[PDB]
User: Fold this.
Amino acid sequence: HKVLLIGKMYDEIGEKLLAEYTNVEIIKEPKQHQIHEAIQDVSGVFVRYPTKLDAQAIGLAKNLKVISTSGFGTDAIDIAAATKRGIVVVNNPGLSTTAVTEHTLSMILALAKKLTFLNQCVKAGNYLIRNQVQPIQLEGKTLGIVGLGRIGSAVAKICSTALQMRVLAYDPYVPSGKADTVRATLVQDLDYLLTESDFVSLHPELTDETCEMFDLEAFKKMKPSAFLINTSRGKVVRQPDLVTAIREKLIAGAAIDVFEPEPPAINNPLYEFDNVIFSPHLAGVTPEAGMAAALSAANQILQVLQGEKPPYIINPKV
Amino acid sequence: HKVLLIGKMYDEIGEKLLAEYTNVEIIKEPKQHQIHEAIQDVSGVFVRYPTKLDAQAIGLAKNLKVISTSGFGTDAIDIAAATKRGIVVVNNPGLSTTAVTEHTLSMILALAKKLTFLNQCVKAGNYLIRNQVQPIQLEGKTLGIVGLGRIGSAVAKICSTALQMRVLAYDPYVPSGKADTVRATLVQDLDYLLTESDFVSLHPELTDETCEMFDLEAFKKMKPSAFLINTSRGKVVRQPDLVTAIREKLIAGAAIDVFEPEPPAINNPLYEFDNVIFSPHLAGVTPEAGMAAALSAANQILQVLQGEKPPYIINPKV
Ligand SMILES: NC(=O)c1ccc[n+]([C@@H]2O[C@H](COP(=O)([O-])OP(=O)(O)OC[C@H]3O[C@@H](n4cnc5c(N)ncnc54)[C@H](O)[C@@H]3O)[C@@H](O)[C@H]2O)c1
Ligand SMILES: NC(=O)c1ccc[n+]([C@@H]2O[C@H](COP(=O)([O-])OP(=O)(O)OC[C@H]3O[C@@H](n4cnc5c(N)ncnc54)[C@H](O)[C@@H]3O)[C@@H](O)[C@H]2O)c1
Assistant:
């Protein structure tokens, strides 16, 4: 059998597992015509996000049995065209879940400890600022998690048990009782999470309800001493309302890994404040997370090519 | 009875607990002669670090039974002069261990996630470094803890279970089995902890055995990819040897909260490197930490003034 890598994988480990059992062709920097001239006599396809997979390419693929995406995004693959030709469309999500949770923990602790601000002062000979800064102790503070999914649960679990925090959670579409498996308390009114929390960490899916969910109206309800952490999606915060929340001191600070205009401009107003800490959308980027994405893509190809059902099919009708 | 507060307590809680049972005089911004003219008819003394306590002031104190420091440091109190007049010198250590534990966690995470370096770049318009930086995933990495005491145990406990790290410990004066209560494994050969660790965090007592314990010879054994965290004491590291470890890249980075010489100068050679992040001896400085020290200093005074032997006597000979 033959397997086509439409673009490189996140790590070479998945390229060797496939080449171990199949014949692998790699298309680096894929063009539209290049897919058709190689997808014909091919049994498995790996699509690196965000390159497109036409209904044309699926049709020119006659022996195609499994198409695998690089991560969570499946919006560039014609899912409808594959359910007709019997092709199984498989996903690879959540494979950077421990990486993002470690990252948000990093940012919660940095905000509480004023890590970035204290580092700059010491480096500027201003060691003496220690008489003007009070680090925050996380123990006993309440951490409100918006989105009790893969990442929110793991973040809640660590903050509730190891860090001894009171953890509240807002997630309408999660089984009531899930929060107890993780030592959080499920909350039905998001206003209650805002008024009780000293730290707010966003982990929801970007739906048509969470887009710009965190408004200036939400910020006014939060404690002046509270912080915001966002490793989810940029659009979950109305970025202009966050700029005024910091400037008007409605909020004590914020840690951001995702941006609404992404990439953010050079002239971003948030960069002005020591209040605000950034990372360039790297929360889920660790070497181990890349291998898990590569290994999960190679394993789900071999499962379909041999009979067995893979775990992440978007095509249950096959 | 009368108690003199040579300086304010870290929180008003210890001053009221003392004022509940004794007559309290407070000397804010204490001068030496002010100590001399008030320590006379007084049974207990609280000395706020770092103000001095002379053999003169101790000599002028006739009814003095207990002197209590504000924290751990007793080097500004004439302990020899107090053992002679029978006065009990009391310490206040271990009252901020959760603060240091949270602080060391902050710095381990920041080093793995390159938090400070990523923040400055994003703020400097260099969002594009995300193609050049790899955050480290803590899960599965080995954390070597030097000193399995109050802070060392707490750091181990969180890292072994919540962060899913293999935790090693080096502590010759600890019962093997203390590491087991905390899901670490106690190790007898420090060379094993240096060659196996991806992160080494120092939490030992500063003795003549740990003084400059971390030499250029120690750094040579660590992995080129490993990191160093020091929230203990500045002298446990030979500061010049740390600079050559960073400069010659024997080590991947370092986070320090304590310095030798302390305070660090404006021209510190470590400030050059993005590898190295600093905090100005604030690891144990949180509001909750101040209250426990205030209460513990006020309680060890009332313990001596009522019969009971206090827990932290530097004067066991009475
Ligand atoms: N490198 C990165 O920054 C990175 C990496 C991975 C994921 N993420 C982002 O983190 C976020 C969380 O990821 P995940 O894997 O936990 O997703 P998930 O699918 O496992 O869970 C998302 C949760 O959001 C909840 N939710 C849905 N609508 C909500 C609403 N209106 N209000 C509150 N909660 C709602 C859902 O019930 C679900 O429990 C996602 O937006 C994802 O894109 C970022
Ligand atoms: N950065 C801060 O603000 C701050 C605050 C409090 C304490 N500290 C420092 O952190 C360190 C740990 O504090 P603690 O409360 O856990 O003290 P601790 O006495 O409870 O633990 C220190 C450990 O050092 C161990 N040790 C002694 N000699 C050793 C050796 N040769 N090798 C390995 N281990 C050895 C002892 O067995 C002890 O267990 C101390 O040096 C303390 O001064 C720093």
